[PDB]
Amino acid sequence: AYVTQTMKGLDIQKVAGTWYSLAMAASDISLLDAQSAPLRVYVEELKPTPEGDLEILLQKWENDECAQKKIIAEKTKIPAVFKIDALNENKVLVLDTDYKKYLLFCMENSAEPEQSLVCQCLVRTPEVDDEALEKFDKALKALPMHIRLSFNPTQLEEQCHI
């Protein structure tokens, strides 16, 4: 069995500083509603707090702007579930990350958000390569996303559009 959750001992501290969004996708277009969607962001850099939580900032596509999203993520003691409590977020589930090479986690916020669950697999892979994508076919792609998004690694080396 190749696990199927967050890994136990999945310490977000193990994924700190790089996140490439090979793809971000949503289970229901509602978490993905909008040409750019609110929870459809690619990650530029993670800044793990001194060790209590992991504070990671990312880039967001706006018709013309670069909006930025806040991820404050603590599962309790802080391993892989986090409430980020900004932009309709309150709980994040990281199913994988640097424990395999890729990361799997979506944002959503408990009130009636499970129809808000949009997983994001951040990359680092042994290449900024669809490696997370094939593994997406399985990671977050392993599922039947209803709005699904994936970009190439070539631009992943650039922030926003510039």
Side-chain angles (χ1 to χ4, degrees):
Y2 262 119
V3 173
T4 4
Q5 195 82 38
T6 70
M7 167 162 164
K8 301 272 278 249
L10 160 43
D11 206 28
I12 189 82
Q13 279 162 315
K14 286 261 132 214
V15 336
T18 299
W19 261 156
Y20 279 126
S21 279
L22 215 74
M24 80 61 41
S27 57
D28 206 25
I29 267 75
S30 56
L31 28 163
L32 234 289
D33 194 53
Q35 264 198 125
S36 61
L39 212 295
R40 165 233 170 152
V41 308
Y42 316 120
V43 182
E44 198 52 77
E45 225 75 90
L46 291 101
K47 290 346 198 96
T49 76
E51 257 161 299
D53 321 290
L54 200 122
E55 170 166 295
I56 132 62
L57 285 144
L58 61 298
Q59 304 159 128
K60 195 178 177 271
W61 183 291
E62 266 336 85
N63 199 249
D64 191 355
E65 266 63 79
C66 198
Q68 224 177 54
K69 297 294 92 138
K70 151 104 131 210
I71 321 183
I72 263 291
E74 331 89 87
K75 124 82 158 178
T76 62
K77 250 73 123 207
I78 289 112
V81 151
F82 307 119
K83 301 131 179 162
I84 93 94
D85 158 58
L87 312 140
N88 319 346
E89 300 172 55
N90 102 248
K91 243 174 80 179
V92 202
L93 337 87
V94 192
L95 272 98
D96 207 305
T97 171
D98 100 71
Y99 276 95
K100 298 237 79 162
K101 60 177 176 224
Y102 62 83
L103 171 133
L104 280 189
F105 94 131
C106 13
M107 293 269 205
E108 99 286 346
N109 182 339
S110 48
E112 165 156 47
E114 213 136 298
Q115 279 87 304
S116 218
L117 220 82
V118 36
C119 319
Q120 258 134 259
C121 172
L122 301 160
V123 245
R124 249 132 96 307
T125 33
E127 285 201 4
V128 44
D129 178 29
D130 290 43
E131 273 152 355
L133 258 173
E134 182 139 8
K135 280 253 103 193
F136 210 52
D137 248 310
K138 273 234 287 150
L140 311 190
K141 247 203 89 257
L143 269 139
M145 282 337 248
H146 275 123
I147 173 47
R148 189 196 69 123
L149 307 82
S150 68
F151 270 78
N152 52 247
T154 308
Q155 298 279 29
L156 259 66
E157 68 111 288
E158 235 174 8
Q159 291 134 355
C160 196
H161 204 352
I162 197 115

